[PDB]
Design a protein around this nucleic acid. Sequence first.
DNA 1: AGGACCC
DNA 2: GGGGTCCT
Length: 370
Amino acid sequence: SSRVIVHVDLDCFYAQVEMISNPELKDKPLGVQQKYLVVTCNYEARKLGVKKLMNVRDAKEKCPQLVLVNGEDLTRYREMSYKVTELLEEFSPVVERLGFDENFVDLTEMVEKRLQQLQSDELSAVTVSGHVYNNQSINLLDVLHIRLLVGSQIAAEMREAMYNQLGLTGCAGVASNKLLAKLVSGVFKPNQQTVLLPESCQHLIHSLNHIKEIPGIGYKTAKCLEALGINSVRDLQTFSPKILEKELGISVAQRIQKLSFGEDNSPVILSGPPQSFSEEDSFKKCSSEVEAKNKIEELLASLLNRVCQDGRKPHTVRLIIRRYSSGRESRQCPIPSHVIQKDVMTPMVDILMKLFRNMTLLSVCFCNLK
DNA sequence: AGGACCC
DNA sequence: GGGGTCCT
Ligand SMILES: Nc1ccn([C@H]2C[C@H](O)[C@@H](COP(=O)(O)OP(=O)(O)OP(=O)(O)O)O2)c(=O)n1
């Protein structure tokens, strides 16, 4: 039972959406701004030495033409993000979202259904769509090559559809599991696709220049390995299981070792509707702590609209803060049943304010949706 | 409640 | 930055 998975990854996503809004920005170098941050930027702008999450500070000093648009309000990028997922759901119901711009679809049932349709003869006419990782030779007599190519044909269709139907371009990687599809999708960008045949899996895995570059291994695990002599993928592949267990837990240990081989048994999960809704707001200090209520009235008013759009009702509220640094904090509590009726801000602002007193950034999160 | 991870 | 997810 070997799977066929596609990882769909949108190009420079926010800049795409802005570029659609204001076409006078197309092929003008564009960065998207949130506070002091240039969060993403278009390819026209990348060429000129802009990188994602560069300071607006430097970024201008590296490009003094860079046209900046404010993207602190995610309403539109969120909305467009869902249209993408929904389009892919039309291909196979089982789409998993990674952030606003990444999607996995498990294509296994679909490829098999396609193959069932073809005869002995047109099975030799099965060709690839896009790049093949590491220029690897197709062997049409290989059942796993055949499926991976049909997989790639499906990916090209998702991509044609996203562009035709939503005006959006992006990348795809096709592979036998989520880790690999995610790694191969980025090999040719922008707006290209790559299929990974199994013989080229070590090659892919070994092209990484650091364990941190593995989806799964984050800021902290990196530092944990780096502090053990482990730096390459092979270092990880060959480190002692037993010792690695003792340091990070049999839980993290045993999975990140699989990962270092290219092995990933984790299923594509159907995302469906969101588990939560939140608004954030960052600032340089707010200690007036009644103005700190106003912030909380803004976050609420907006959040309230979003749940009012959904039609599902949240049963828990959360307030999150951070104290001037020199870690975030949260207080939860249920939403009272009498006030789960969609007047409503008037009672909510108190719940949050006593939650407030029980304690740079203010944040409200609604969760436990029914 | 706070942590690790993702974008 | 401004969002999300699942686990402990
Ligand atoms: N660490 C991150 C990663 C992403 N984002 C935001 C900015 C992006 O518009 C979007 C997704 O980021 P990606 O890393 O997938 O990069 P893009 O899709 O924006 O550009 P590209 O795929 O060409 O690198 O969410 C962010 O704020 N902080």
